[PDB]
C-alpha cells in the first residue's frame, strides 16, 4: 500500500 | 527472508504534449505487483501480481485515489522544480521517487526510503534515519526546507514503519507461493569458439528468482573480475531473471576456468565449469 | 541535460530451440529520460503487437523496460532489437543471439 502523502 | 516494498513514481512532463505523465509501479521485490499510469485510457491502479488481486474494491479506489492525487502532485512537483532550477516550462523533466521499506524474515522494518531524483539525478532522499533529509542542491534544500516545515519525514516514518511494513507482510503472505519462493539460477557453461586462439565460456544463471545473483568467473580460483563481460541481470518475463557472465579464455585453457554463482534459491554457492 | 543511453539486451525466455514457441525479449534498460522507442524486429521488419512492461527504474533512477513478444525462433528468422532514444543519434539495432 501506498503512502499518498503529496 | 528478506523483502522490500517499493513504489516508484515517475512523473514525466511532455510540454505540448499534455499534461506530465504519472506512472506508479509497486514492486514487493522483483515482482511488480501494482501499477498506475495517468496515461492509461481509464487511470487505475491496477494489479499485475495475482496476489494483490484479493485486496478489496477500497483497497484499488483508496490506491487510485493516491495516484490521482499524486498525478496533480507531481505534475504540481514539476512545475515546482521547474522554478527551483530556473527551467523552461518548455523541456521535458522528470521527476522520479521511490520509497518503500525493507523488512526482515520477521517482518519488522528493516529500514525505509523515500528517496526523489530530477532528471534522473538524486534529489531528496530520506535518510535511514527517517527523520531527516539528504537534499542533493540548494533547490533539494527547498524542499528539504519546506518538507521538515511539514514534518515530511515524520510523516513518512510513520507510513515506513505502519502501512508499508503491514502492507507488505500482508502482501508477502498473500503472494508467499511466489513472494516467499526463490527459484534458484539453472545455470550451465556454454562455450562459443571465437577462434583458434580463445573461446568464449558463458556462465548462464537462468530462471531464477529473485534478481539479485552473484555470477563470477574464477581463472585459478581467482576472481576474473576485470575479464568477464557481466549482463546486466535481464527479466525473462515469466517473473525470473536471466544474467551470464563470460570469460575469454585461451584455447584448450577451460578447465582453469569456474563460474560461481550465489543466488538466495541455491542452498550453497554452485560452481560450474565446462 | 545529463541523459543516459539504453543498455539493450535481446534475448528469448528460455533457450532457443528452433520450432518451439518462446518469448523474445528486448531489455532496455539504464536509459534516461524513460521515452523510448523499442521494436521487435523479425527479419528487419518490425513485429506488431510487442508488449513491454510498465516502465520501472533502477536504484540509479535510469529505466528499464522490457519488450517481449511471443516467436518462434527458427535457423534462419534473424530477430533484433531496435532501440531509438533521446541520447541516440539513430535507432540502434541489437540482433538477438541465442546464445546471448
Given amino acids: 500500500e501506498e503512502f499518498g502523502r503529496c | 527472508g528478506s523483502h522490500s516494498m517499493r513504489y516508484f513514481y515517475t512523473a514525466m512532463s ?14 514487493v521485490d522483483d515482482t511488480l505487483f501494482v501499477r498506475f499510469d495517468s496515461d492509461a485510457t481509464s487511470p487505475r491502479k491496477e494489479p499485475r501480481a495475482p496476489w494483490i488481486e484479493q485486496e478489496g474494491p477500497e483497497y484499488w479506489d483508496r490506491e487510485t485515489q493516491i495516484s490521482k492525487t499524486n498525478t496533480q502532485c507531481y505534475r504540481e512537483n514539476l512545475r515546482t522544480a521547474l522554478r527551483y532550477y530556473n527551467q523552461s516550462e518548455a523541456g521535458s523533466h522528470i521527476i522520479q521517487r521511490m520509497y518503500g521499506c525493507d523488512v526482515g524474515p520477521d517482518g519488522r522494518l528493516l529500514r525505509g526510503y523515500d528517496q526523489y531524483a530530477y532528471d534522473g539525478k538524486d534529489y531528496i532522499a530520506l535518510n535511514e534515519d527517517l527523520s531527516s533529509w539528504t537534499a542533493a542542491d540548494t533547490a533539494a534544500q527547498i524542499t528539504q526546507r519546506k518538507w521538515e516545515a511539514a514534518r515530511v519525514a515524520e510523516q513518512d516514518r510513520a507510513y515506513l514503519e505502519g502501512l508499508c511494513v503491514e502492507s507488505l507482510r500482508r502482501y508477502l503472505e498473500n503472494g508467499k507461493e511466489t513472494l516467499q519462493r526463490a527459484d534458484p539460477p539453472k545455470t550451465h557453461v556454454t562455450h562459443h569458439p571465437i577462434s583458434d586462439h580463445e573461446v568464449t565460456l558463458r556462465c548462464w544463471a537462468l530462471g531464477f528468482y529473485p534478481a539479485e545473483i552473484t555470477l563470477t568467473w574464477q581463472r585459478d580460483g581467482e576472481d576474473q573480475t ?20 563470460a570469460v575469454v579464455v585461451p584455447s584448450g585453457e577451460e578447465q ?14 554452485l560452481t560450474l565449469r565446462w | 541535460m545529463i541523459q543516459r543511453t539504453p543498455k539493450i539486451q535481446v534475448y528469448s525466455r528460455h533457450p532457443a530451440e528452433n520450432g518451439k514457441s518462446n518469448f523474445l525479449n528486448c531489455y532496455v534498460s539504464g536509459f534516461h529520460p524513460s521515452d523510448i522507442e523499442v521494436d521487435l524486429l523479425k527479419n528487419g521488419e518490425r513485429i506488431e503487437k510487442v508488449e513491454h512492461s510498465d516502465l520501472s ?8 523496460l522490457l519488450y517481449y513478444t511471443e516467436f518462434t525462433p527458427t535457423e534462419k528468422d534473424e530477430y533484433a532489437c531496435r532501440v531509438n532514444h533521446v541520447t541516440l543519434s539513430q535507432p540502434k539495432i541489437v540482433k538477438w543471439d541465442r546464445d546471448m
Fill in chain 2, 256 to 269: 582453469r576456468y569456474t563460474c560461481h554463482v550465489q543466488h538466495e534459491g541455491l542452498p550453497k554457492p
Fill in chain 2, 14 to 27: 511532455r510540454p505540448g504534449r499534455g499534461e506530465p505523465r504519472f506512472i506508479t509501479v509497486g514492486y
Fill in chain 3, 57 to 64: 527504474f533502477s536504484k540509479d533512477w535510469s529505466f528499464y
Fill in chain 2, 226 to 245: 576485470q575479464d568477464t563481460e557481466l549482463v546486466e541481470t535481464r527479466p525473462a518475463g515469466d517473473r525470473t531473471f536471466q544474467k551470464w557472465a
